[PDB]
Write a protein that binds this ligand. Structure first.
Ligand code: EU3
Ligand code: EU3
Length: 326
């Protein structure tokens, strides 16, 4: 199971991983982890072809055979043609060395190159629920958008470190306490205690409320399938938050911040997009992709759902499933 590019003149080195031959990034060539065996092949545009097998000092007495065998399977995709040489570390071939300018760098133990230290960095999901219930208390997740508030109801805004029980002007005092009670839980249990709560009266919204929702406009009183949902990813707040900016389909374009990444969830019927603003940073990029994951994962979306990344300016005619034709 070789690439089939093995014919192209030049050099090919594969570190025999386990059973599979892995081609060494052109930079990494010249350095051989000594616990593995490698295969290196050099062939001139008219010259012969020598396929040497490099065996590390700490390379298994067997890992060797495995590799030699693989040499064979390859001798054959070229058929008996390549020349075979057994190169042992510490006594390579005056020819083997010919493939390497500066010299060899035998490594040992330690960790694979490009080895990174993945740091699970939690994210704060800012959520807004619209409480409702005379007897029975049920807070429903709404989108964190003023288009969500009404004046005769209470709402809870879980902004992580701080929670708010904003209270409709035309809502009850009873309705108000239910809100505070529920939200008081949210800090007590889910926050395990560390997080501030503050009851808010319509009108008197604190900075933070406006810092997330924006400029408060007028609100409605209250009486009258497209799963698409718009979320935003920004660490602007010195911390990475995920916020569900909208959940009805004709999305208001204003919604989109040139400074953050967004994720347009539509996996239900297809793809999940990730829009990147010019000024959005990479943690935002890194993270918007990772949230696209959690979206297919948690909602158990079709396996083959595609996550098409769209840069600002260069948005796809489909993505424009926002109100006035974008
Ligand atoms: Eu080994
Ligand atoms: Eu930003």
């Amino acid at each position: 199971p070789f690439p089939g590019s093995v014919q192209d003149p030049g050099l090919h080195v594969w570190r025999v991983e386990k059973l599979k031959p892995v081609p060494v990034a052109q930079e990494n060539q010249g350095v051989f982890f000594s616990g593995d065996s490698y295969l290196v092949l050099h062939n001139g545009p008219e010259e012969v072809s020598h396929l040497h097998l490099w065996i590390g000092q700490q390379s298994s007495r067997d890992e060797q055979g495995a590799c030699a065998v693989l040499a064979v399977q390859l001798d054959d995709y070229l058929g008996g043609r390549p020349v075979q040489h057994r190169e042992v570390q510490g006594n390579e071939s005056d020819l083997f060395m010919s493939y390497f300018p500066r010299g060899l760098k035998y490594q040992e133990g330690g960790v694979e190159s490009g080895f990174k230290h993945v740091v699970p960095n939690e994210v704060v999901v800012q959520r807004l629920y619209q409480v409702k219930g005379a007897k029975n208390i049920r807070a429903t997740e709404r989108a964190l958008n003023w288009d969500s508030f009404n004046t005769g109801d209470c709402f809870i805004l879980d902004l992580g470190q701080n929670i708010f029980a904003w209270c409709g002007g035309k809502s009850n005092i009873l309705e108000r306490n239910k809100a505070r009670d529920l939200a008081l839980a949210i800090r007590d249990s889910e926050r395990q205690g560390k997080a501030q709560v503050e009851i808010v009266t319509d009108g008197e919204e604190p900075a933070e409320m406006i810092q997330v929702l924006g400029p408060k406009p007028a609100l409605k009183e209250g009486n009258p399938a497209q799963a698409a949902a718009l979320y935003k990813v920004s660490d602007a707040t010195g911390q990475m938050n995920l916020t569900k900016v909208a959940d009805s389909s004709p999305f208001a374009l204003e919604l989109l911040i040139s400074d953050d990444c967004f994720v347009l969830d539509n996996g239900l019927c297809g793809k999940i997009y990730i829009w990147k603003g010019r000024k959005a940073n990479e943690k935002e990029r890194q993270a918007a992709l990772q949230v696209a994951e959690g979206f297919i994962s948690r909602m158990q979306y079709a396996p083959n759902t595609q996550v098409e990344i769209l840069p600002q300016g260069r948005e796809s005619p489909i993505f424009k499933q926002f109100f006035k034709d974008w």
